[PDB]
């Protein structure tokens, strides 16, 4: 099994930034891609970005290109995501996800087999 | 299975003892630019990435390097192998302050970010093979191509 | 860039019946970069299918993915009350990865 324990929910004001963590355990940390997916209330999923910790190769979607920063601490097996310039639109449940592997316990598949519990970020003032 | 990746005959090459890290990257990237697999200034972005994010892996017996850049600068998926006569020192990818004496370089050019870990998994499987890596030090360009092409098609 | 348009938007079947969910792509996506997810209310998405046809570990045989290029389909053959959830299709053949709007099966 692979577990992804995210940080608790937060309530930020418009303009401020937020940094959500994703503690990974159970499998290898560096050799697999960790992604961040967002879901607003009754809206559906959108891929914010991701990172492969071994070489720090972070990738971003054009929409969040600039205001989103994804990093991975190899010494604590934790992935992060910092969204800056927060607005009402950014109010959503933020998931960290990791790609699965072929077979039991394997080559990486790409699709997100493991997901965190989610972090509810609310933007209001 | 690392599928959908190109590998031609001119992608394997040997480098002399006088070459440095930046010379090896420029040499291994030259066939990729000519075939139109990456952008014209692909080698430049690989050097800048290596300085900030090292790719040297101190695997025994033969040290390995996996130099690359963002998928933004890759047009088509490809890999080029580079063998060294004398060991050149790459920085540790793990972040350790000890140097990695690399003799075999696997330059990766991947257009899809989601296919990166498939390649890495495939490289990690090959470099663990002690008998195979020892053969790469002795094998010539023609012999290396046939060995890698067979391993790649699985 | 690549938009995924799923259909139907909402569906309501009885237990035992077949459910054919579709996922059309704006451009030609390679079969090896298509995945289906199941998301029940209050839970994270559970991976059902990856690489168009390949089925994830622990997922039963009744789920079966099929398609290539633009048209992709998820077939839920023998519906169970536990299968009542929203189903998303995803492409990860290039950056940025994009999901569909979702199909609610009742």
List chain B residues with CB under 8 Å of C97: 114
Q: How was this structure determined?
A: X-ray
Domains in chain A: how many in total?
1
Domains in chain C: how many in total?
1
Tokens of B149: 């092409």
CATH fold, domain B1-154, is Mannitol-specific EII; Chain A (3.40.930)
Using the Cα atoms of residue A118, residue A60, residue A67 and residue A77 in order, give the sign of their dihedral: positive
Resolution in units of Å: 2.9
- Using DSSP's 3-state secondary structure scheme, residue A66 falls into coil
Shortest Cα distance from A27 to chain C (angstroms)?
Answer: 16
Please count the residue pairs, one from chain A and one from chain C, whose beta carbons lie less than 8 angstroms apart.
65
Query: Which residues have C-beta within 8 Å of that of residue A108, sequence separation ≥ 6?
Result: A31, A32, A33, A99, A100, A101, A102, B117, B118, B121
Domain hosting A5: range is 1-125
Are residues C96 and A109, on separate chains, in Cβ contact within 8 Å?
A: no
Are residues A31 and B94, on separate chains, in Cβ contact within 8 Å?
A: no
Q: Cα dist. C7→A17, B78, C39, C79 in Å? A: 37, 36, 16, 18
For chain B, the domains span 1-154
Are residues B120 and A59, on separate chains, in Cβ contact within 8 Å?
A: no
Q: Hey, of B113, B116, B118, B119, which one would you mutate to test binding to chain C, going by the most C CBs within 10 A of its CB?
A: B113
**Which of C51, C52, C37, C46 is CA-nearest to residue C87?**
C37
For residue C37, give the CATH number of its domain.
2.60.40.10
For residue A92, give the CATH number of its domain.
2.60.40.10
């Amino acid at each position: 099994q692979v577990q992804l324990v995210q940080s608790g929910a937060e309530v930020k004001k418009p303009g401020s930034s937020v940094k959500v963590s994703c503690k990974a355990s159970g499998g290898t940390f560096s050799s697999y891609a960790i992604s961040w997916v967002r879901q607003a209330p009754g809206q559906g999923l959108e891929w914010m970005g991701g990172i492969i910790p071994i070489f720090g190769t972070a990738n971003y979607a054009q929409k969040f290109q600039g205001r989103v920063t994804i990093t991975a601490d190899k010494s604590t097996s934790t992935a992060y995501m910092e969204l800056s310039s927060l607005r009402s639109e950014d109010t959503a449940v933020y998931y960290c996800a990791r790609e699965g592997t072929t077979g039991w316990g394997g080559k990486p598949i790409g699709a997100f087999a493991y997901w965190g519990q989610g972090t509810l970020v609310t933007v209001s003032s | 299975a690392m599928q959908g990746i190109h590998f031609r005959r001119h992608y394997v090459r040997h480098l002399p003892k006088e070459v440095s890290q930046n010379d090896i990257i420029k040499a291994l990237a030259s066939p990729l630019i000519n075939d139109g697999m990456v952008v014209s200034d692909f080698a430049d972005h690989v050097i800048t990435r290596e300085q900030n994010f090292p790719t040297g892996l101190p695997v025994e017996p033969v040290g390995v390097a996996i130099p690359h850049t963002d998928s933004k600068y890759v047009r088509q998926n490809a890999i080029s192998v580079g063998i060294l006569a004398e060991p050149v020192n790459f920085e540790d990818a793990g972040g350790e302050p000890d140097p990695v004496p690399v003799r075999v370089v696997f330059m990766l050019a991947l257009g899809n970010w989601f296919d990166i870990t498939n390649v890495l998994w495939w490289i990690m499987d090959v470099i663990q093979d002690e008998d195979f890596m020892q053969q790469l030090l002795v094998m010539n360009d023609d012999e290396i191509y046939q060995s890698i092409y067979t391993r790649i098609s699985e | 860039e690549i938009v995924l348009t799923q259909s139907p938007g909402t569906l309501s079947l009885s237990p035992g019946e077949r459910a054919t969910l579709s996922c059309r792509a704006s451009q030609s996506v390679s079969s090896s970069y298509l995945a289906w997810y199941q998301q029940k209310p209050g839970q994270a998405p559970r991976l059902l299918i990856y690489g168009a046809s390949s089925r994830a570990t622990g997922i039963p045989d009744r789920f079966s993915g099929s398609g290539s290029g633009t048209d992709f389909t998820l077939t839920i053959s023998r519906l169970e009350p536990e299968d009542f959830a929203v189903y998303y299709c995803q492409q990860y053949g290039s950056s940025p990865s994009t999901f569909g709007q979702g199909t609610k099966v009742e």
